[PDB]
A paper describes a structure:
Overall, the [name] structure resembles other characterized HKs, such as the Thermotoga maritima HKs: HK853 and ThkA, although the [name] dimer is asymmetric. The functionally important residue Tyr550 (colored in yellow in Figure 3A and 3B) is located at the middle of the first DHp helix (α1). However, the DHp domains display significant structural differences (RMSD of 3.4 Å for 80 Cα atoms), indicating that the [name] dimer is asymmetric. The input helix in [name]-B is kinked more significantly around Tyr550 compared to [name]-A, resulting in a conformational change with respect to the Tyr550 side chain.
In contrast to typical HKs, a conserved tyrosine (Tyr550) appears in place of the predicted phosphorylatable histidine throughout [name] homologs in α-proteobacteria, with the exception of the Magnetospirillum magneticum [name] that contains a non-phosphorylatable alanine. From these studies, we propose that the [name] pseudokinase has repurposed its catalytic HK fold to function primarily as a sensory module for a phosphorylated RR.
Residue numbers in the entry:
A (entry chain A): 526 to 570, 573 to 758
B (entry chain B): 526 to 570, 573 to 714, 719 to 756
The structure:
């Protein structure tokens, strides 16, 4: 029918326009920061200059992650992402995520901590995909945490699983967005995670696991990756 | 009701794949360059630092232009770009493109010339989109022209049409790539010439390349009266 064919085309257009509009927002927002701060560098003779460079590098790195997220999410949606399962030492995985984010943490005046015991040992998964999962959770945490705050990376082997936690002393997730926190391009007041948290969920779920958010506006936030043991 | 809705979503997911592909292919080289040179400036005490800034600035401006191209190309592919037809004085259009590119021309040691007769007069079209078309052609010309060379912006009203030419005394395009010169990523930025073709074709026109390998290159916009 005429009305059914019209409604179908309208729905296909709305779903495309929203996707392009969401990806577009993620391209143009870090870009404004890169232009603004690189122009200040051009007209500079230093500590002030260093802060300008750091702001350029952080915005450029965030733009790069958004593009990688769009590509990795499309690969997952097509069912084209297969994991390369191998032995992963959790201790190193946590310390590598801490050193990769250390510069962006000092720029935001935040302390990155690692609280992992020697008894956590080795898990079996995809190193690249688990490193990318932690990276998304740490940068999400740094964006929410104010200067003087703390972001903690912890791991624990208990109840037939390994759980990776990324705690922050930031602003908590308001109740209404807590149910949609792992949805693509979910509207956040402090700053948008884009495809970052949807990717965390998809990557952990590809490992046979699941993700959770424990939050309270005045008591920070905790993101947990529950990874079951393979007997 | 089910087959029509499915075919519509399949077509929209075809558009998505192209957009996502363009985003990845066009933006990642300037981005990596900004990150690498920024990392050097972060761990630096200067003459060397000024070269790092210049590299960050060139990559930043190329990132801005590439993001515009990727977004404009997606809008065109979806059929969501409608032109705002109005009276355009060709003489001003050519001088506007010359003054916007004048700085990048002097940086590359190239001479930017305008050869338009006041007999060309006025044309009908979208001023923003025609200015953007000339900008892409001048950019393309400046990238091909060596220092000491010349890039010319000309216009001519002949045989029931107006033709805008952007000539260059650069390397010249080889005959085998001449037929595919307006194809996306046929070779830096790869949507510029595909955008020129799409914008001129939206104006009811067509584009052409006149090039001799060694002599030069000329890009013409044929806009019918």
């Amino acid at each position: 029918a005429l009305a059914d064919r019209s409604a179908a085309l309208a729905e296909a257009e709305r779903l495309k326009r929203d996707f392009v509009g969401n990806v577009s927002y993620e391209l143009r927002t870090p870009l404004t920061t890169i232009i603004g701060y690189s122009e200040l560098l051009e007209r500079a003779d230093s500590e002030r200059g260093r802060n300008h460079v750091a702001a350029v590098r952080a915005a450029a790195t965030q733009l790069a992650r958004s593009i990688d997220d769009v590509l990795d999410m499309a690969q997952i949606d097509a069912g084209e992402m297969a994991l390369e399962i191998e032995d992963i030492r959790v201790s190193d995985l946590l310390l590598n995520a801490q050193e990769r984010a250390l510069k962006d943490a000092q720029l935001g005046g935040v302390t990155l901590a690692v609280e992992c015991e020697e008894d956590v040992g080795l898990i079996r998964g995809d190193g690249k995909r688990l490193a990318q999962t932690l990276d998304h959770l740490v940068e999400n945490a740094l964006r929410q945490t104010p200067p003087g705050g703390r972001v903690t990376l912890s791991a624990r082997r208990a109840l037939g699983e390994v759980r990776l936690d990324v705690s922050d002393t930031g602003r908590g997730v308001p109740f209404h967005v807590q149910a949609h926190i792992f949805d693509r391009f979910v509207g956040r007041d402090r700053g948008g995670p884009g495809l970052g948290l949807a990717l965390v969920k998809a990557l952990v779920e590809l490992h046979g696991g699941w993700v959770a958010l424990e939050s309270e506006p005045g008591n920070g936030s905790t993101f947990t990756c529950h990874l079951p043991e393979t007997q």
